[PDB]
Structure formats: C-alpha cells, structure tokens
Swiss-Prot record, chain A:
Protein kinase involved in the transduction of mitogenic signals from the cell membrane to the nucleus. Phosphorylates MAP2K1, and thereby activates the MAP kinase signal transduction pathway. Phosphorylates PFKFB2. May play a role in the postsynaptic responses of hippocampal neurons. The modification Omega-N-methylarginine is found at R203. This is Serine/threonine-protein kinase B-raf. Residues 8-249 form the Protein kinase domain. It is linked to Defects in BRAF are found in a wide range of cancers. Changing K124R: Blocks EGF-induced ubiquitination and ERK activation. The keyword Nucleotidyltransferase does not apply. One of its GO terms (molecular function) is protein serine kinase activity. Monomer. Homodimer. Heterodimerizes with RAF1, and the heterodimer possesses a highly increased kinase activity compared to the respective homodimers or monomers. Heterodimerization is mitogen-regulated and enhanced by 14-3-3 proteins. Heterodimerizes (via N-terminus) with KSR1 (via N-terminus) or KSR2 (via N-terminus) in a MAP2K1-dependent manner. Interacts with MAP2K1 and MAP2K2. Found in a complex with at least BRAF, HRAS, MAP2K1, MAPK3 and RGS14. ATP binds at K30.
Length: 254, 252
C-alpha cells in the first residue's frame, strides 16, 4: 500500500502534524517532522500493519502510507468535527435518536476492532469524528532507552513494563463516551483538578453519576452504560453483547 | 487471502437485487452481500484472484469491500449505504437535483474512476445503475469484479482486439455525464436495442447533446463530448478530466 512520493500532494495543516491534501480527491495526511529515527520507523511499520487490516464504514478509511519525504499515513478526508467539539464545545441540541445512532455506530466500530483483536488504547469522544452527520468514524490510535537500563530505580523499572490496556479499558472508555452522549457534558464536571480525578478513579472512589443523564434517555441505555462501567475488569461485558443491546433498544424505541 | 469472513457470522436478510443476488445482511452492523449461483477449486482460484483485485481499493467514493465468504455460498460482503442508485434518482425518481449537486456527483465519480485507473483497474461494467448515493450525496461505485494456436487468422484477429480498456470506461463516464446533465437515458427517441447497437457500432448515432440542461456549463459539455469520441484515442485521460472537473467546480 506504499504510495509513491510524487503522487501525494500536500496541503493546508489543520502529536504529529496533520495536513489536508489532495490525492485522487480530498485526503488527510499525518506526517511527523523528523530527519527519522529507526525506533520510530519500527513503530510506524507496526502502526501501518495494524491499520492495513481495517475495512468498515464506522472506522476511518486508511488509504496508504508514505516514507520518502517524511514518515506519514494518508487516509480519507471527512467533513465535520469531533463528537467532543459537537457535544461539549458547541453544545448542539442533539435529539435522542441522533445520540443513540452515534452510540450504535461507535459500538459497531468497536465490535469490529475487537473481533480482529485490535485494541484501541486511546478511545475518547475527541477521537470520534462525525462525517457529514450521524456517520461515525474512529481514528487517532518495552524499554526503548537501552542505555539507561542499569541506573533506573525499581520504581521506574516496574512502571515501564506495565501493560494496562485491554478490551476492558476500551469498554470503560465506551461507557464514558455514552455518558458524554446522554448527559451532554464531560464526566466529573465539578472536579476541575486532574490529580483528584486520577486518584479517585485509581482508588475506585469516584464514578460518573448516571443521575445527570437526560430525561429523554431510555432506562435500558442507562443500564447498559452502568454495566460497562464496572470497576472490576472481568465484570465488564464484551462488545458483541453491547452492540446487540444497543440495536435492540434502538429498535424498541424506534 | 486474509479477508475471508467465516461461515455463520453473516446473517442474511431481504433480497434487494438480482450479475449476482444482493441481500442486506447483518455483520458488525449493516452490510450488503452479493452472492453467485456457483464450489470448484478451479473457480475458487479465480474467485480468490477477483478478491485480490478488490482488495487494492480504498477510497471514499469507491464502495468499501469488507470481505468474502466461501463456506455457505461464494459471496462478496461490502458496506451498506442508505439511499438509491443514481439511475433511480435521475430516471426513476426524477429528483430535482441542483446543478451543484450534479457537478459534485460528477466530481466524485471522476475521483473514484481516476483512483481505479491509477491502480490499473478496468471497470468493465460502468453504468449509472452501479453508482449508489449513500445518504443523498456520497458516491459509491461497484460491480467491477488457451486454444490460441489452433485459431485461424480470421478468428485470431478477434482475440487481439481486447475492447475493454480505459477508453471504454471514459466513454461510460461520458454517458453518465449525459444522464446527469440531461436527466434522461440516452437515445430516448429510438428505444430499440438492435437499432441502437448497430448505429452506435457504426458511429452513425451519438447521444443528442441538444437535450442537455441549460444550467450545464460549457466546459462540462465540452468534456462530455470529448469523452464520447468515436475514436478511442481521442478520448481524454481521467486525470485531466478530474482536474478540469475540479477547476469547473471551483469556478462555479
Ligand atoms: C484507520 C487509521 C486510523 S490511525 O490510528 O492510523 N490515525 C490517523 C492517521 C492519519 C490521519 F490523517 C488521522 N487524522 C485525520 C483527521 C481528519 C480531520 N478532518 C477531516 N478529515 C480528516 C484528523 N484530525 C485530527 N485532529 C487528528 C488526526 C486526524 C488519523 F487519525
Ligand atoms: C465493492 C467492490 C465492487 S464489486 O465488483 O466486488 N461488486 C459488488 C459486490 C458486493 C455487493 F454487495 C454489491 N452491491 C451492493 C449494493 C448496495 C445496496 N444498498 C446499499 N448498499 C449497497 C448493491 N446494489 C445493487 N442494485 C441492484 C441497485 C439498483 C437499483 N436500486 C433501486 C431502484 O432502488 C437499488 C440498488 C447491485 C449491487 C450491489 C456490489 F456491487
């Protein structure tokens, strides 16, 4: 899928540098300013290999990768903004039907990812793009420092090996996104302190209150959302059941 | 080779077409499954090669191939799009489309065809019925999937022609432009299959450009006529067509 250098035309810039380019129509190319790094080259190869096996309407359409001018990924161009900008920044009055439709499409995309054992580690409402309208597209998804291995303390050695991301973190992020959709605001809106939220969520003391959900939201949706926010990882359900429940609730509520 | 959807995962539904029988199925959301009346290894290798041809297509304006199934029946599974075919919009429904929407549909089809030809892919059955309008303004294109020594010089010449090429595709694109601008199928007066076949084969008949809408620009009609050249070599290449269409869209 390597696109030659001369074929790709660069355009306006809108981590990593993103630019809206023109290549057989509108595309978006993300390149990193480097002149690169072999470690970054291996990471780019792994990211390209992960992105190549993805074909779904609700997943962003990867179109190619370029390596000659700068290590870069070229995908389709979609008109609109992120769900974070729609709900939080503009506070657009979204009908409950549009909310449950966005939820169903996000669930389709996540079920597709998990069916391929692909782990979207940074799933958030800011990485959920709304092409046109009511069309969801998802994107923006080992001690390398070999020399300083001996001098680091057991505090930092143990931290580098940790691998917390799994399907359960993804379903928790999906539940938080459902909270954003239904309430219309970021969770823990009162607590404007990062450290407090981090500590209270790490100790499981704080969870987003489902009481602030909009009155138009059905009860089954809130039940599924609360089920996805289980503190214990194993209690959280798998995404096929989530998609089935969302589709059933949408069919019931027309 | 690694895109086969296993059996039982795909749930079939109502038939929405009957090249191949089309059905709206459910597999990680709404999908569309096209099935073939055919299980033989010789045919299986050809199906695998066709799948490999379909795998090198990733474009917003090209229909999204999502997988192939061989266990219950040999079938191709792609995305599901809400809407109808451009043929249904213009001819069957006669939806009042603004000239901006028409030139945008033309630009999207041109992007898709230029991408296909850039991959050295020859869409042999290009027609306005294979252009689906997802939502109501997103174009999706699909339906594009020896005894030589013993043959006499009379019959050998027929094999050497190879009539399908990029020029046939740009001719079909010109016919699609005619449908877009006029709003009706070409040769509406004749309505005879054999007569039209003969007269177009001898180059005696061309779609009458007088029935074109008044709103259509002159550059668009010029490009359309350039794509309908009887001689294959006179027809322009799709990159130049895409550039001209983009410039005309920016101007208007
Ligand atoms: C299947 C591949 C997933 S991926 O994990 O490989 N990630 C990825 C790769 C390449 C990309 F270009 C973008 N990307 C595109 C837009 C974009 C914005 N507006 C209109 N069209 C597109 C954008 N906007 C941002 N802000 C940030 C990143 C953006 C990617 F997310
Ligand atoms: C992607 C690689 C290219 S491919 O060469 O491999 N070919 C291929 C492979 C697999 C496929 F499923 C379809 N295919 C999908 C829909 C589809 C339908 N509805 C929503 N989304 C998609 C569809 N519709 C079709 N017809 C009959 C039209 C005609 C008129 N209509 C009216 C009057 O209403 C509606 C529909 C025909 C084929 C269709 C393929 F073209």
């Amino acid at each position: 899928w390597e696109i030659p250098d001369g074929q790709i035309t660069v355009g306006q810039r809108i981590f990593g540098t993103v630019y809206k380019g023109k290549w057989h129509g509108d595309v978006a190319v993300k390149m990193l300013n480097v002149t690169p790094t072999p470690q970054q080259l291996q990471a780019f190869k792994n990211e390209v290999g992960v992105l190549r096996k993805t074909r779904h309407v609700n997943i962003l359409l990867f179109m190619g990768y370029s390596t000659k001018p700068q290590l870069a990924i070229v995908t389709q161009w979609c008109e609109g903004s992120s769900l974070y900008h729609h709900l939080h920044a503009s506070e657009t009055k979204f009908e409950m039907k549009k909310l449950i439709d966005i939820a169903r499409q996000t669930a389709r995309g996540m079920d597709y990812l998990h069916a391929k054992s692909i782990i979207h580690r940074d799933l958030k409402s800011n990485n959920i793009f709304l092409h046109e309208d009511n069309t969801v597209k998802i994107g923006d998804f080992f001690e390398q420092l070999s020399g300083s291995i001996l001098w680091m303390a057991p505090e930092v050695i143990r931290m580098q090996d940790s691998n917390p991301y799994s399907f359960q973190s993804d379903v928790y992020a999906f539940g938080i996104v459902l909270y954003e959709l239904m309430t219309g605001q970021l969770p823990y809106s009162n607590i404007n302190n990062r450290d407090q939220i981090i500590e209270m969520v790490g100790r499981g003391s704080l969870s987003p209150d489902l009481s602030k959900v909009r009155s138009n939201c059905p009860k089954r949706m809130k039940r599924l959302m609360a089920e996805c926010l289980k503190k214990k990882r194993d209690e959280r359900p798998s995404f096929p059941r989530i998609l089935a429940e969302i589709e059933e609730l949408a069919r019931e509520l027309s």
